UniProtKB/Swiss-Prot annotation, chains A, D:
ATP binds at G42, R43, S44, G45, S46, G47, K48, S49. Induction: Negatively regulated by YtrA. The lineage of its organism: Bacteria, Bacillati, Bacillota, Bacilli, Bacillales. Residues 4-231 form the ABC transporter domain. This is ABC transporter ATP-binding protein YtrE.
Swiss-Prot record, chains B, C:
It comes from Bacillus subtilis (strain 168). Keywords: Cell membrane, Coiled coil, Lipoprotein, Membrane, Palmitate, Signal, Transmembrane, Transmembrane helix. A lipid is attached at C32 (S-diacylglycerol cysteine). This is ABC transporter permease YtrF. GO terms for cellular component: plasma membrane. Residues 115-165 form a coiled coil. A lipid is attached at C32 (N-palmitoyl cysteine). Part of the ABC transporter complex YtrBCDEF that plays a role in acetoin utilization during stationary phase and sporulation.
Length: 231, 436, 436, 231
């Protein structure tokens, strides 16, 4: 479960004598339960990005508290929040974040190495997950030698390698074609329908948002339209 | 993240820039070789000075010449300490001496008063003869033939020396005595200097049996023509040839069984403090000066090692800048600050440690080259064949290798500390948004 | 490309990485300061040895023993040499002197008779009086009054020296005469020794008036109290006080111009077969070792400089790789490979030369600190005046500054040559297009 | 006035044991007159980019000869090719290829700094060149703080400031808006109208090509339909 309520954030930009504070989040009340695809719909820089940053753990929110899996994360320092991200989080960032260089197999295995999984178990998990996603027939294929759709697919495979409760994503199809958009979206839908996994996908497209179990439209920094309309 | 995965990541990232990490490793290797070779110059100076000290004189001497307060220095109060092997007592005699055997007279001779029992418990190097425990038995010096020149030969040698003035030219003479130095029961000019001051009374000359001869002295250049008069005859010698006092220089030895026993005897000072000139007392000041010299050379090498440390820091900030994407998404995954700091501190420590190992091997090679070339250079330059002596101008003990490893690993880790903090404080948001 | 434009471009590309540029400049600075200080240790050893030699001996006294084959050395030929001030023909006869001026007397007063025209025309030591010209007239030294003292004072002096017993500490006797010596009638009674050897024939009555005083004796060396006699008495001195066979010792000075002229005269006389010895003789004897030591210390500084130049090379390779795009665009416009190579060689040489300049400043500071510390540590043993020993590091980087600048700039250019070639060999097509 | 007679070039891409010589040029006979916008329209890898890189001086042709302003440039080395590019060439590359940092005034003055023009005339030259293009109210404005259109305009300004005779360009509207493309092409038209200058623009399209005084189509490398199409 994800519990976000009365959360606000402000950004200070400029020199010490030119500290300009522009609040973005205004008492966000995002509430997601286990095993549904939540979604945040808003314009570019409207406030979805900062909300995803706070929910992931990159920025500590200024006020309010955030609870994931029944545990308070606002007071987490960098070490504890990173430990939480290791074992209970996954990431599908838009830029595909695929380590320019290296290989697909090692890109997928990277979070296993970070957590500390033993080698043969790592091999088994990577092979099984790459088989599940569908990019198993590439092995040591460098990310630069893949297309953007395959980059998104291998990023998803990396996210699923530690079977986390939440695999909250940025816009997974921000730079993607419509066909690859539909493919990635149905892949994520099948993820939820196979294994109960919370999603906090943030996008500026409502068609991408349509697959979710909940709608959360953020207009100019304040959330609204929080419903659970069945698709 | 365990250790194998961290090593794999470090190797993968270092493989990206081979010509840069190899150059950093070369700079560190040259600095470690520099530090070890330069400090080993001082270490070898200390080792060769210690070896020269051991070779120049007897390893176990413990001379107590120069008693303060004019208090008695009699042997009767000198035997009771920890495992003192010998309390040999010496009183040199300044008398006109010349071997009264034919036309050959041994003008140069240094009579030494000793009991042969104290000699046996002192283990002085003896070439011939078991013991001379008798009133009329002596042991002659090793150079008893070279200094035993005939009157005409000595006169012509002195005239030839005067012809060449004070210049030490090739002026040489045959080695005097050529017959056997076996048991002959010969007498050597016990003629009095008025017992010891100034007048020369009745000559008088005891007949002494030559039981044996002494071995080669502690050094080749210095000669030896001792007589080794028995200490049982010392009572009558004092009674008739009263020399006690100044034509008298006490050379009492406190020789112990071994060098560690010399060290413990030196520790047992402040009661037998008779101005001891033992090898340990003399070498304490040398050890202090060598500690200062080795510390100075260690610091001088440390300057050149800090230069390579600055180079390591440069290449490590270079690596942090190049690895910003990988570190950023690793932090996004949850790599934790501790793991990334350990990874980058380990990359810096690996650069430093590989540089130190390669530089220590190179330093062993350079020290071998120096130890082989320095005797050759000494032989070639100042026309002396290096004196046919053994020197160690460059010695690298295991201690010096330990200091080198510690210093170079420490400076490498210190250099990597700031890139490690930079790589932990990546601000993942920036690295996850690319650039424009 | 104008030089100002290249400087502006270097400023732009150096402001990008202020920390890395400052760190490689600091590595170069430490290497240059290390080189300069280490070679300055040897330069100061050479300078202090040279200063000690120049202070303990008179610089211009080019003493010549003679010629090969014991050929006599005439006075006339020595004049006709290069840039010779004048030749000294001082003659000294080993014999005690019994001056005995009135109730006063002198003992050593060894004879220094010689033709004074040449000596005083050879910048001889003097401050008052006139050269000895008349038959009964001589030139006296400064310490004459020190030994001049009444008969009772002479008995006191004799008692003091007899009771001294070889202890020249309680021998501080009063000076005695503290008045003017000029214009007196000293009844000199130089002791005879049967001309030279042993019998003492008859001491002449050298009733010579006192006109002429010598100043303080050279540079705090030599005793000038000895009486100086002119050439007017040479005939009767050779007739009565015959010295030719033995006792005579006519030291030859050969005074000349400044020290470089002294060295030139020394080598000119050596080329003729003379037995030349002077300050430059000992200086050249030690100069081979000093050159070897300076070269070795400069080579040690050179390996430190190479340690820093590897870091410079890393910084410059990362500067070439880091931009590659300003370089690509300039090459596309037509900046030419020569201009790019000059640009990057200028950047590398600027890092090296700034490091060398501030290393020179820091090494001047460090040498000053060493000059303030070495006497402060080694006093109470030999640095009583404290203006000696290591009081040398003020001038030391005279040619050492030039050598250090040349070495560091050149090695920086070598280190930056490869990054310059990399920059001039950047493919324009690859450089222009982005790397995703 | 450019003459490209019988020029071919092959891309020898691959390892020493994996050599693969793929010819991208097939004996082109392109001819360009003085004071006209020669447009060479082709496709990606057809040969337009290779032909521009060959005529620019980055690539030496394998066979044939090229005459530029009555000067053979086939055997020219790097130094003389760069000198030629300096005194008689100009460049309008697609990405605008502007130096990061290096304020727009200095960015325009950069080729004068390369040639060696003294700053006194340099200041005025950059001033009127920026005024003519239409970006004179920018002064110390970083290129990264500009838009794509104005970045292309300042790239043109850097092209004209040395007063060249050939200003061969990559796609000047490869990353541009429709309005920015229209105004930049109109700027090129007024440029050739007012000051005698030759354009060798290569485009992946035809609407931009229609501005040129000549059409040269590169179908996989072979030139077809080379005529002086009056504008």
């Amino acid at each position: 479960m994800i519990d976000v309520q009365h959360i606000d954030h402000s950004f200070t930009i400029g020199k010490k004598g030119r500290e300009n504070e522009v609040p973005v989040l205004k008492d966000v009340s995002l509430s997601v339960a286990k095993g549904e695809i939540a979604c945040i719909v808003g314009r570019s820089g409207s406030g979805k990005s900062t909300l995803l940053n706070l929910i992931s753990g990159y920025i500590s929110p200024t006020k309010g508290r955030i609870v994931i899996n029944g545990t308070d994360v606002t007071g987490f320092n960098e070490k504890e929040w990173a430990q939480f991200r290791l074992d209970h989080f996954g990431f599908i960032f838009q830029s595909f974040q695929l380590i320019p260089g290296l290989t697909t197999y090692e890109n997928v295995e990277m979070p296993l190495a970070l957590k500390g999984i033993k080698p043969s178990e790592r091999k088994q998990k990577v092979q099984d997950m790459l088989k599940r996603v569908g990019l198993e027939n590439h092995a040591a294929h460098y990310p630069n030698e893949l297309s953007g759709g395959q980059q998104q697919r291998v990023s998803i495979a990396r996210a699923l390698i530690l079977n986390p409760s939440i695999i909250l994503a940025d816009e997974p199809t921000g730079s993607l074609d419509s066909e690859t958009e539909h493919e990635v979206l149905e892949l994520i839908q099948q993820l939820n329908r196979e294994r109960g996994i919370t999603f906090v996908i943030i996008t500026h497209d409502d068609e991408v948002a349509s697959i979710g179990h909940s709608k959360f439209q953020l207009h100019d920094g304040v959330l609204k339209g929080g419903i659970t309309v069945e698709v | 993240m365990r250790f194998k995965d961290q090593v794999h990541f470090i190797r993968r990232n270092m493989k990206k820039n081979r010509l840069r990490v190899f150059m950093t490793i070369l700079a560190t290797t040259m600095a470690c070789a520099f530090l070890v070779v330069l400090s080993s110059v001082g270490f070898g100076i200390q080792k060769t000075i210690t070896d020269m000290t051991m070779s120049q004189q007897i390893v176990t001497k413990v001379s107590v010449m120069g008693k303060e307060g004019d208090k008695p220095i009699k042997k009767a109060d000198l035997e009771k300490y920890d495992h003192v092997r010998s309390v040999v007592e010496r009183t040199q005699v300044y008398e006109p001496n010349k071997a009264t055997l034919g036309n050959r007279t041994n003008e140069s001779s240094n009579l030494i008063f000793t009991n042969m029992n104290d000699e046996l418990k002192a283990n002085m190097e003896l070439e011939k003869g078991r013991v001379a425990k008798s009133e009329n038995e002596i042991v002659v010096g090793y150079d008893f033939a070279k200094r035993l020149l005939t009157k005409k030969e000595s006169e012509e040698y002195n005239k030839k020396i005067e012809e060449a003035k004070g210049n030490p030219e090739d002026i040489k003479e045959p080695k005097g005595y050529t017959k056997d130095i076996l048991n002959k029961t010969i007498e050597l000019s016990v003629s009095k200097t008025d017992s010891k001051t100034g007048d020369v009374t009745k000559t008088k000359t005891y007949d002494f049996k030559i039981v044996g001869i002494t071995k080669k002295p502690s050094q080749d250049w210095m000669e030896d023509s001792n007589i080794f008069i028995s200490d049982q005859f010392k009572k009558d010698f004092s009674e008739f040839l009263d020399f006690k006092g100044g034509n008298v220089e006490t050379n009492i030895g406190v020789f112990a069984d071994k060098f560690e026993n010399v060290e413990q005897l030196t520790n047992d000072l402040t009661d037998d403090g008779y101005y001891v000139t033992s090898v340990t007392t003399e070498l304490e000041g040398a050890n202090t000066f060598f500690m200062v010299f080795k510390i100075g050379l260690i610091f001088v090498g440390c300057i050149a090692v800090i230069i390579s440390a600055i180079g390591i820091f440069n290449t490590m900030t270079m690596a942090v800048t190049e690895r910003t994407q990988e570190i950023g998404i690793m932090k996004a995954i949850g790599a934790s600050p501790s793991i990334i700091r350990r990874m980058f501190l380990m990359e810096s420590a690996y650069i430093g440690i590989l540089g130190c190992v390669i530089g220590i091997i190179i330093s062993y090679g350079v020290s071998y080259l120096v130890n082989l070339a320095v005797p050759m250079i000494l032989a070639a330059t100042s026309g002396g064949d290096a004196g046919d002596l053994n020197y160690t101008f460059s010695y690298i003990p295991a201690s010096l290798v330990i200091i080198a490893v510690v210093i170079c690993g420490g400076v490498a880790v210190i250099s990597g500390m700031n890139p490690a903090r930079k790589a932990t404080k990546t601000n993942v948001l920036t690295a996850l948004r690319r650039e424009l």
